[PDB]
RNA sequence: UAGCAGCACAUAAUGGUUUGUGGAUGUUGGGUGCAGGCCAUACUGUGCUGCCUCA
């Protein structure tokens, strides 16, 4: 609160302020400059009034000038070099004054230019004095000020200083310095320090003093120790008189060690110090070796001699195992009593030296362990480059209740509220008292001091002096009842609870660690003296207007009454109530039945209904390349064959797009085209068709699984498949009745033929009969058929020819010996054969003696065309399901091909996957939901928006909607394994892997997302938005001084508007965008948090669209990696800094200010990423979209040039998440071990790549450790490549 | 172009052994991390193969 009070005080009247550190100094300076900068902008004659800075030293000039230039928008000018400045003339300073707006110069230069008068006193606006204390002394600032005050119209001077309280006899010296300073500056002074502010607002801590008396040892060993200390001093004197070199100071370590020894012995016990001394001796021996002078080395050896002498005296210690409070310093007993009194216990102890702190911690720990009563003890200590990391680790260990610390604890650490601040010794200066007492912020705050009885005499007057200084500092700073309804509704309301209610209401509002929530109240003054209070809620509140009540004299009455009437408005908003206050998880899986399209259901042909016939046109569009071909059997284009299959059905089949299949010839396109229609069949003919269909199916494919049994009727899939041939030589295909009936009467219909070949009736071979032939060997595998295609006839090869193996000379010998088979004809040819395809999943690309054989009835050309029949029929079922879904949802529709892409899960391993559509649909879903919420509920804050958005887009909600609309029932998940899972038509299981599929809810949600991606990529944005309404997700509609204050407050954003290359028709949205929560002066508009919600969703949807439309068509892993990279907040922050948005951003949080000040120089070189930068970056995008009338394309032309240099870099070298990257490289062999906690508190994880090694990684979190382990694994694997 | 049993060698794995080395509460060294050198059990892959589907 002090920062806001100082800012508004400086705004109201000329202010003098005493600071503590340079951060606040620069901060208040630049902040007031920004606040009053509106008066400087504009090269207009009636107001050409500038701002000037006066400094004493060049180094500070450079520091401040650079800080202002970097973080300010106004151009800056410097006139520091006195000789150069003085070597100038009036007409050349003229253009210098005209050029820059902010001027910085040294004291001598300032006095020179003021003396000459060029810098008009009326042209200065904010005369800021740095190190204002110099004005007290005989400094040129006095002359400068008498000059300025001589003018009629004067600037708003400000004095900034930090050297106050440095006096000796402060109770009167400070008063005189303050009075003389203020009368010179003719202004009011305000002061603000952490402790004084905390005590002013709370005044909770209580101070306590504890007296201690000296204690000696009966053994007198203490005196022995003093005499060895004196011996050490004598040795140091001997070294001093014999240093023998002015440039050598190697004795410093020696006197430092002796100083530590005497200090620790006098203050506390020596045993801890003596024990810890050995570690320093381990380095001291190295220093001894490093020592060059033999005499000095000998002295340092005597230093070791002394240390071991004390070690020798340590033998006199009695029972070192436990001290029993018999040899410790009496202060230890006092400390133990203090600790026991409260024996929570969040205690902070202060001590002088670091070594003293270490030994004190050791002593306290040992006492706690030895004393059984000491059970609450949990102590730690505060104090190469590793030590800094250790300090950070110890900061993370802040949860310890007892912390010992040295003087460094006064700053640089956000210690929580403490209930017990122990001061082990008398503080040296009032400032130390301030910093030390400024930490006991707990309610039960006890600031306890430990002091020797003798020294209390001085400490008493010191305490008096300190409290007097605090008192003068404080003094200088000082200088009907509401009811819901008449009868019922809830509890009564009292006047005193109003402040508490307002406070908790303020606490309810959203905030981040950098912001602070607090209302502002002040009294309007009245001539009658009955000033009335006015209240202002934070900018994020739903309403922004002054709340007032009747005018009363009393402050308490006015404040409570204004709070009470405020509660009326809070309830009108609805903030007050009657009291005025797993599913969707990867684990869950369900089995669902498959569904057959309605067009295919009830398709059994019958004579009393006309029937339709479709032809399965097949064309070899893309034959396999010759180089790829290794099997080398000749290609078989099915178009040459006059025969072709077709589907006979009783109900028309809707059209479906052409689709491919992959077979021997390669990629063959299918066309299920209706060629003939409106024709019945005879009864007997119908039985012929049906029996032949069963015969062909069963025997050709051999899929008569005993679990299944045939049903001529009553099965859901009852569509017939038949062959066709050109009939009557008319070039028109038809059902070849003659061919079917001839095959039906074939003698080789069942079983192998028993040929009657003999020497009198030998076998005769006819090439034409074997031109197209499938032959079944008879002799081999009786009752176990094996079919082969005829490749070609090798007339040159005969049974009498030479056999390959040396076991037999000829094939005839092989047949006569291994099987004893007679051949009637000896001089007859042989032919080559090929094995019938054992594989049946053709849905995706994976890249003999004729006498013994028997001719199969069906020709091999038709057999080859039949091998694709199951694949084609299954794909037909899939496409028909997809088309039915598309038509139902339509009732310019989306392509069923994309629908198929959206309905197939990745587990199926199908060539058509389900990721790109998923990603696009998910992004669009988020954007649509966010836009709907923004439009439907204008009066809502970020908490409500974010919670409702996450609830609406919740995966459980998506699962519920999908199941409600029946969407999950349509996907395909199982890999196509027809031998196991396929249920062919006419066959059903006779009393699950056939009629049921198990799918996870995650996959269901992914499919629903893909559907959205499909519709967005096909039917356009409007149709995609309408799709959610079709799904039921409601996202479309059902179907006094403002101008002058805005005109002033807009300041100079025009120079930014030219950078963004765009101008809004309404100026309110710029202010909406950049209005931070802390800059409460803007009472006209809302904050930026509301614009964050819309801006993020806009930029996410735009970036996802741009990545998806990339013609490279990266894999889903790359897409996910790129999405995470582009959406990363560090990236958005870097982009904001690259385009200097921070130069125009305005905020009040000093912590945020310092963080940004560091962050900006970090990027200027080219580390905490400030969240505000990303927030403003998103909010600007939201502003562009809001003014553009819901036109995304306009936002794209604005932001694409901004993003263009980054996407090129990322696409050129995509950063791949190590986790998913490893999972993709080794989806099965990579196994991650459970989380293991190491002794240092970190988590160790082991990843095992089966067959490639185990890798261990350590990290603060399980995810980080996994990432490190994956990185190590990938690095090893690539090194091994 | 099928199935299966041995052999050479690489691998990391679960156990140990031993030389060196580390900061550490180090009551006078068993708490723990990383290099070399060995012993046992066990996994995968290319070859040396061998038998055995079909001709």
Author numbering: 46 to 388, 441 to 480, 497 to 592, 612 to 713, 739 to 1004, 1033 to 1076, 1290 to 1389, 1543 to 1590, ...
Copy the relevant paper text.
Vertebrate genomes carry a single highly conserved Dicer (Dicer-1) gene (Jia et al., 2017), which encodes a ∼220 kDa multidomain protein that appears dedicated to the miRNA pathway. Cryoelectron microscopy (cryo-EM) of human Dicer revealed a protein architecture that resembles the letter “L,” with a complex helicase domain at the base, tandem RNase III domains in the core, and Piwi/Argonaute/Zwille (PAZ)-platform domains at the cap (Lau et al., 2009, 2012; Taylor et al., 2013; Liu et al., 2018). During miRNA biogenesis, the PAZ domain, which has a strong affinity for substrates with blunt-ends or short 3′ protruding overhangs (Lingel et al., 2003; Song et al., 2003; Yan et al., 2003), binds the base of a pre-miRNA stem loop and the two RNase III domains function as catalytic “half sites,” each cleaving one strand of the double-stranded substrate (Zhang et al., 2004). The helicase domain, which has a clamp-like architecture of the RIG-I family of RNA helicases (Fairman-Williams et al., 2010), is located near RNase III domains and is composed of three globular subdomains: an N-terminal DExD/H subdomain (HEL1), which is separated by an insertion subdomain (HEL2i) from a helicase superfamily C-terminal subdomain (HEL2).
Similarly as reported for human Dicer-RNA structure (Liu et al., 2018), the full-length Dicer•pre-miR-15a structure captured Dicer only in the pre-cleavage state in our cryo-EM data. In the pre-cleavage state, the PAZ domain anchors the 3′ end of the pre-miR-15a, but not the 5′ end, in contrast to the human enzyme binding pre-let-7 (Liu et al., 2018; Tian et al., 2014), likely reflecting the absence of the human-specific α helix in the PAZ domain. The β sheet face of the dsRNA-binding domain (dsRBD) binds the central double-helical region of the pre-miR-15a, in contrast to other members of the dsRBD family, which typically interact with RNA via their α-helical face (Stefl et al., 2005). The terminal loop of pre-miR-15a binds to the outer rim of the helicase subdomains HEL2i and HEL2. Overall, these interactions are characteristic of the Dicer closed state and position pre-miRNA away from the RNase III catalytic sites. The closed state may allow Dicer to recognize specific structural features of miRNA precursors, whereas it would impair processing of mirtrons and dsRNAs because they cannot be optimally recognized due to steric hindrance in the pre-cleavage state. Importantly, the RNA-bound full-length Dicer closed state is virtually identical to that of the apo form and is stabilized by the same residues at the DExD/H and RNase IIIb interface. An interaction between the DExD/H and RNase IIIb domains locks the rest of the helicase domain (HEL2 and HEL2i) in a stable closed state in which Dicer recognizes miRNA precursors by anchoring three elements: the RNA ends, the central region, and the terminal loop.
